[PDB]
Design a protein around this ligand. Structure first.
Ligand code: HN3
Ligand code: NAG
Ligand code: ZN
Length: 1016
C-alpha cells in the first residue's frame, strides 16, 4: 500500500548530497563562459533529417515589490507591459509571450474594459499569451512554508481558471535564490507536468552540463518508486537575461538584445552593441547566433532548444516590442531558409518547448536521468553564497508564520457555516489570502526589498491579520451561541484575540487586560480554538487586573491555575543595566485548556477578594549584584533577591534543567535517574570583511568564525510555579528566556540588535553529541534533509535555511531545535547547532538592492528545544538522504506554528453561551493534519462545496505503543454529504469520485485534497 519512506534508499542517477561530497567546487576561468568551458560541437550533428528546433520564448520578469512597492511598479511599469502585450500580440499573430505573476495580471485585468477583456481571453485561448506556473507570485523557496507556497499557487490558479479558463501545467522559476524539492512535490500534486529552474550553484551547473544532466526527473529524497517525479529543466548559465540565455558567450548574446542600442538607456558591458538586422548583415549575424544556439544545444539531450528572451520588467515600450520582434523575425526568415544551418527557429511558449521535448523522448531520441535533493546554498560567483537572506528582516519572517496560522484558523472557523454576503466573510478571507500570498514573493519573505517596500508588506500583513481576527471572532460567536438567540452585527467585535507571542512582550504592548472587580464585573468568558484534528491540551495565559482570579470550565468545574507577575525588560540608561520591572496594575493567569479536534472550548475567569482555592502563585527570584526592591502592586508573594548563581528547575515530571550564573542552559536531565546531559546555549557575533566583498541582505560573508558576545554580569530572573517556570536574562541585544511547562522547554529571544552596524547575532548550542559532519534541516516545513558540513567550502556555504527545524544526532542522542520563524543556521562542528537571530549590515552587496540592512526592529523569536534518546528508534540507513522527527519534536513544532487561539468576550454578558464545539469531531492519528479547510462556495450555491488539504508526516518508530485513534473522514465532517471527490491540491480538478463518500487517509509523507459536496 504505502511506500516505506524510511527503510528503502531510492536509486537515482544524481543524488545531490552524494554529488556535493564528490565535487571539487573549483572556481576556474572557463573562458567566455566564465564558469564553464569552451563548448565544442560537431557541425554534422544536425542535417536535413535531424534539424535543431529552436523556441525563442519572450518573457518579462515582474517583481511584486522590490525597489518599488507592488503598486508603484504596477503604475510605472507593469500596467504598460500588459497593455502593450495585449496590443502587440493581438496585432502580430506569430508573436508569443509568457506570464508568471498572477497578482499583477489580476490587478490589470480587473481594470480592463470588456472589449479588451475579450481581446485578452482570445490571445490566451489561441496560445499567444501563456501563463507559466500561475501562482500569485514566484515565491521564495528557502524561507517559505509549503502551506503558503500552496496558498499562493491556489490563489493565482483559482483566478486563472475563473477568468481565463486555463490551468498551467508548466512552471517557471527563474529568480528565487536556490531551489527546493518542495516545489515539484506541490506542483506534481497540482496537475503539473514540467518545471524550469535557474538559480543553482555555478559549480552544479558546470557538473550537470558536462554529463547532460540539466534535464532530469526530480523525485523526492524518500521516494523509492518515483511517483513524485516531475520533469525539470535547469538553465545552464549565470542569468536569465538575454546575454546569458542565447548561448555560452554573453559578449555575443548581448548583441541580440535589441533593447541595448542606446535610446533605451541600456548598453552592452562587453563593449559590442547590438546592430539592426538587415539584408547586408543577416548572414553574418545568423552565423554568430546559430553558433551560440548549437553550443547551448550541446548541453542537452534532445534536438529541441529553449531560448528565453527577456529580463526584468521588459516588453514595456511599444518601440521595444517592435525592435525585438522585427529583428528576430529577420533572423528567423534567413536561418530557416538556409538549409546549411539545419535549424528551424520560431517564437514559442514554455509549454510548446516541453511538449516538443517529450515528443523527442517518446521518439526514443533521449532518456532522462533521475535526481533527488535540493539546490541550496546558492552561489552565483566565487565565494558569494546567498545564505544572508535566510535571516534578513527577521521581524517579517516571524510575521509570516503568524499570519500563516491566522489564515488557516480564519478559513477553518468560518468554513463550518454558510454566510450571508452582508457578513463580508469571503471578502475578508480573500484580502488575507492575497496579502500573505504576496509576501511569499522572492523579495518579500526573503528580506531583500527596500526599506519602504518592507513597510508596505508589513502594512498589508497587518490588515490581513485584522481581517482574520474579524472572521475568527464572528465565527466563534456563531459556533458557541444558542441558535435561536444568535443575533449578529457583522461589524461588531464580540471577541478580541489575545496572542501571547505576537508581536510579543517587549515588541508591542498590544494585549488587552481582562478587567474584573467586585464593583464592576465579577467574571469573563474566554474561548480557545484548536485548529489541529486531535484533542489538545496547552497552557494558555491572559492578563488580568487582579491576582485573585480563578478558572472554571462551562460545567463550572474548577480548573487549576497559576498567577505570575507581568515582567518587562528595560535598558536602564541611568544604571546601564538591562533588568525587569514588574507591573503594579496587571497580572498573568495561566491554566491548561483542553480543546476538541478542530473545535472550541469555553472557560470562565472569576475574581475573588482573596487567594482562590485552585489558583497558585509563582515565586520570583532576581539574581544580580546591587539589587533594589521590586514591588508588584497586589501580587501576594514578595520578590526574593540573590547574587548570581547556578540554578536548577523542574516542572511536573518533566526534564530537570540547569543554568549557569549568566542564566543560560548548561544541562538537561531527562528523568530522575538519567545523566545531566551537557547542552549549553551561547550567543556569539559575526562581523563583516574590511576588504573585498561585504555582506548585505543576500550575502553572508563573515570575517571568520563568530566571537562570543561579552555578557558582563547580566541580571537573571527566575520564576518558579507549579504549572510554568522560567529563567530570563538580559543580555546585550537579547532578552533570552527558557520556559518550562513539564515537557521540552520553550525558548524565547527578544532580539534588539540596536545600532550595532555590521553585526550578525547567532545563538549556538554546544553538546557532546558525536554528530561529526552531519546535521539535518527542514525544507519548507515539509521534510527534513540530511546535510553534510564541507570544510572544502567556506563557512557561509555551510549555512542552510532553517524554515522550521534542525537537528543533530549520534547513535544514542538527538537534539532538535524547532522554530516559529525561518532563520539561517548550521552545525559548524560536531555536537553544535546554531541559528542566526538578526543581522545589521551597513553596505550593499551588489545584487541590485542598493542598500544595506539598517531597518532592524525588536522581534520575539520562539523555539522548542527537544533532547531525546534515539538508540531505540528505527532510523533510515547511513546512505538515506532524509531524516524524520520523533512524535515529541513534531508536536513541539505544531505548538509553535499552530498554537491554540484565544478569544476574550468583549461585552459584559454573553447571552446563550455554550461550553464546547467539536466534541464529536474525530481525533485523528498524531501524524495527520488538516492543513487547510476552506468552504469553496458562496451562500447562493444550491450545492455547497468544502475543500480539505490532508497532510500526513512521517514520525520515527521508537517503541511507544500507538493508542487506538479514530479514522478521520473529512467528507463527513459536514452533514448531508452528497459527493466526495479527490482533487488536485488547488481544488481545481477532480481526480477521483469516491466510494461511499469516504475520503481515505493518506500515506506517510503524502498530501491529498478532497472536496465534499452538500445538498443541505
Ligand atoms: C549588479 C547585479 C547583479 C545581480 C543582480 C541580481 O541577481 C538580481 C536578482 C536576484 C536578487 C533579487 O532580489 C532581484 C529581484 O527579484 C529582480 O527580479 C532581479 N533579482 C542584480 C544586480
Ligand atoms: C474552457 O476550456 C475547455 C477545455 O478546452 C472548453 O471545453 C470550454 O468550452 C471552455 N469554457 C468553459 C469551460 O466555460
Ligand atoms: Zn525577481
Amino acid at each position: 500500500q504505502c511506500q516505506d519512506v524510511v527503510q528503502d534508499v531510492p536509486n537515482v542517477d544524481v543524488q545531490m548530497l552524494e554529488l556535493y561530497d564528490r565535487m571539487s567546487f573549483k572556481d576556474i576561468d572557463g573562458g567566455v563562459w566564465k564558469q564553464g568551458w569552451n563548448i565544442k560541437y560537431d557541425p554534422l550533428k544536425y542535417n536535413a533529417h535531424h534539424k535543431l528546433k529552436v523556441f525563442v520564448v519572450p518573457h518579462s520578469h515582474n517583481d511584486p515589490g522590490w525597489i518599488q512597492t507592488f503598486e508603484e511598479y504596477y503604475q510605472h511599469d507593469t500596467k504598460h507591459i500588459l497593455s502593450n502585450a495585449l496590443r502587440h500580440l493581438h496585432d502580430n499573430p506569430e508573436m508569443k509571450f509568457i506570464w508568471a505573476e498572477i497578482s499583477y495580471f489580476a490587478r490589470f485585468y480587473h481594470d480592463l474594459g470588456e472589449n479588451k477583456k475579450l481581446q485578452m481571453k482570445s490571445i490566451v485561448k489561441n496560445g499567444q499569451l501563456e501563463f507559466v506556473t500561475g501562482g500569485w507570485v514566484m515565491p521564495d523557496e528557502a524561507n517559505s512554508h509549503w502551506r503558503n507556497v500552496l496558498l499562493q499557487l491556489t490563489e493565482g490558479q483559482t483566478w486563472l481558471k475563473q477568468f481565463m479558463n486555463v490551468t498551467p501545467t508548466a512552471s517557471w522559476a527563474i529568480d528565487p535564490f536556490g531551489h527546493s524539492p518542495t516545489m515539484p512535490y506541490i506542483l506534481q500534486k497540482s496537475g503539473f507536468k514540467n518545471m524550469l529552474i535557474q538559480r543553482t550553484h555555478y559549480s552544479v551547473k558546470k557538473e550537470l552540463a558536462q554529463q547532460r544532466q540539466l534535464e532530469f526527473l526530480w523525485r523526492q529524497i524518500w521516494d523509492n518508486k518515483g511517483d513524485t517525479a516531475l520533469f525539470t529543466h535547469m538553465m545552464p548559465f549565470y542569468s536569465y537575461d538575454i546575454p546569458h540565455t542565447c548561448g555560452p558567450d554573453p559578449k555575443v548574446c548581448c548583441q541580440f538584445d535589441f533593447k541595448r542600442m542606446g535610446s533605451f538607456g541600456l548598453s552592452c558591458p562587453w563593449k559590442v552593441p547590438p546592430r539592426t538586422i538587415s539584408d547586408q548583415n543577416v548572414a553574418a549575424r545568423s552565423d554568430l547566433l546559430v553558433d551560440q544556439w548549437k553550443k547551448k544545444a550541446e548541453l542537452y539531450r534532445t534536438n529541441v532548444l529553449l531560448i528565453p528572451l527577456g529580463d526584468d520588467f521588459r516588453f514595456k515600450q511599444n518601440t521595444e516590442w517592435d525592435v525585438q520582434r522585427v529583428n528576430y523575425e529577420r533572423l528567423f526568415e534567413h536561418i530557416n531558409s538556409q538549409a546549411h544551418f539545419n535549424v528551424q527557429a520560431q517564437f514559442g511558449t514554455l509549454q510548446e518547448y516541453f511538449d516538443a521535448v517529450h515528443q523527442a523522448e517518446r521518439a526514443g531520441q533521449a532518456e532522462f536521468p533521475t535526481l533527488s535533493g535540493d539546490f541550496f546554498t546558492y552561489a552565483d560567483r566565487s565565494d558569494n553564497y546567498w545564505s544572508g537572506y535566510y535571516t534578513s528582516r527577521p521581524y517579517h519572517k516571524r510575521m509570516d508564520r503568524v499570519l500563516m496560522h491566522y489564515v488557516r484558523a480564519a478559513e477553518m472557523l468560518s468554513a463550518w457555516h454558510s454566510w450571508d454576503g452582508m457578513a463580508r466573510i469571503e471578502e475578508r478571507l480573500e484580502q488575507a489570502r492575497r496579502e500573505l500570498s504576496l509576501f511569499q514573493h522572492h523579495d518579500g519573505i526573503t528580506g531583500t526589498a527596500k526599506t519602504h517596500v518592507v513597510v508596505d508588506y508589513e502594512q498589508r500583513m497587518q490588515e490581513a491579520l485584522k481581517a482574520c481576527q474579524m472572521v475568527m471572532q464572528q465565527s466563534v460567536y456563531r459556533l458557541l451561541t444558542k441558535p435561536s438567540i444568535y443575533s449578529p452585527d457583522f461589524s461588531f467585535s464580540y471577541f478580541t484575540l489575545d496572542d501571547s507571542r505576537w508581536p510579543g512582550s517587549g515588541v508591542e504592548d498590544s494585549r488587552t487586560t481582562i478587567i474584573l472587580g467586585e464593583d464592576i464585573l465579577p467574571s469573563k468568558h474566554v474561548v480557545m480554538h484548536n485548529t489541529l484534528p486531535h484533542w489538545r491540551e496547552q497552557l494558555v495565559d491572559f492578563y488580568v487586573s487582579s491576582p485573585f482570579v480563578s478558572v472554571t470550565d462551562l460545567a463550572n468545574n474548577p480548573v487549576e491555575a497559576q498567577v505570575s507577575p507581568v515582567w518587562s525588560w528595560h535598558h536602564d540608561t541611568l544604571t546601564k543595566t538591562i533588568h525587569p520591572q514588574g507591573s503594579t496594575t496587571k497580572y498573568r493567569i495561566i491554566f491548561k485548556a483542553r480543546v476538541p479536534p478542530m473545535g472550541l472550548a469555553t472557560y470562565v475567569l472569576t475574581i475573588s477578594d482573596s487567594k482562590p482555592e485552585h489558583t497558585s502563585y509563582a515565586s520570583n527570584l532576581l539574581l544580580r549584584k546591587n539589587p533594589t526592591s521590586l514591588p508588584l502592586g497586589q501580587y501576594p508573594e514578595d520578590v526574593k533577591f540573590g547574587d548570581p548563581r547556578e540554578i536548577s528547575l523542574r516542572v511536573g515530571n518533566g526534564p530537570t534543567l540547569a543554568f549557569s550564573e549568566q542564566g543560560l542552559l548548561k544541562s538537561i536531565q531527562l528523568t530522575q535517574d538519567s545523566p545531566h546531559v551537557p547542552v549549553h546555549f551561547k550567543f556569539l557575533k559575526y562581523g563583516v570583511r574590511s576588504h573585498g566583498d561585504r555582506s548585505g541582505a543576500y550575502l553572508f560573508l563573515p570575517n571568520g568564525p563568530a566571537s562570543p558576545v561579552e555578557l558582563g554580569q547580566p541580571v537573571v530572573l527566575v520564576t518558579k510555579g507549579k504549572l510554568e517556570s522560567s529563567v530570563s536574562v538580559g543580555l546585550p541585544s537579547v532578552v533570552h528566556q527558557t520556559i518550562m511547562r513539564g515537557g521540552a522547554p520553550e525558548i524565547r529571544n527578544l532580539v534588539d540588535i540596536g545600532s550595532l552596524d555590521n553585526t550578525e547575532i547567532v545563538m549556538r548550542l554546544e553538546t557532546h553529541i558525536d554528530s561529526g559532519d552531519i546535521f539535518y534541516t527542514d525544507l519548507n516545513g515539509l521534510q527534513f534533509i540530511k546535510r553534510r558540513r564541507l570544510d572544502k567550502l567556506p563557512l557561509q556555504a555551510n549555512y542552510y535555511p532553517i524554515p522550521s527545524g534542525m537537528f543533530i544526532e549520534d547513535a544514542n542522542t538527538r537534539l532538535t531545535l524547532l522554530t516559529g520563524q525561518p532563520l539561517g543556521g548550521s552545525s559548524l562542528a560536531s555536537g553544535e547547532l546554531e541559528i542566526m537571530q538578526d543581522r545589521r549590515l551597513a553596505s550593499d552587496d551588489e545584487r541590485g538592492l542598493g542598500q544595506g540592512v539598517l531597518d532592524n526592529k525588536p522581534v520575539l523569536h520562539i523555539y522548542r528545544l527537544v533532547l531525546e534518546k534515539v538508540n531505540n528508534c528505527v532510523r533510515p540507513s547511513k546512505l538515506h538522504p532524509a531524516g524524520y522527527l520523533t512524535s515529541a519534536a513534531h508536536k513541539a513544532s505544531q505548538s509553535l506554528l499552530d498554537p491554540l487561539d484565544k478569544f476574550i468576550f468583549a461585552e459584559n454578558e454573553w447571552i446563550g453561551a455554550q461550553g464546547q464545539f467539536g466534541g464529536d469531531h474525530p481525533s485523528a492519528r498524531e501524524d495527520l493534519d488538516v492543513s487547510v479547510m476552506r468552504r469553496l462556495t458562496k451562500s447562493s450555491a444550491k450545492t455547497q462545496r468544502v475543500g480539505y488539504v490532508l497532510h500526513r508526516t512521517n514520525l520515527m518508530q521508537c517503541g511507544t505503543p500507538e493508542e487506538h485513534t479514530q479514522k478521520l473522514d473529512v467528507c463527513h465532517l459536514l452533514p448531508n454529504v452528497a459527493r466526495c471527490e479527490r482533487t488536485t491540491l488547488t481544488f481545481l480538478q477532480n481526480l477521483e469520485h469516491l466510494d461511499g463518500m469516504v475520503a481515505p487517509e493518506v500515506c506517510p509523507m503524502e498530501t491529498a485534497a478532497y472536496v465534499s459536496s452538500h445538498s443541505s
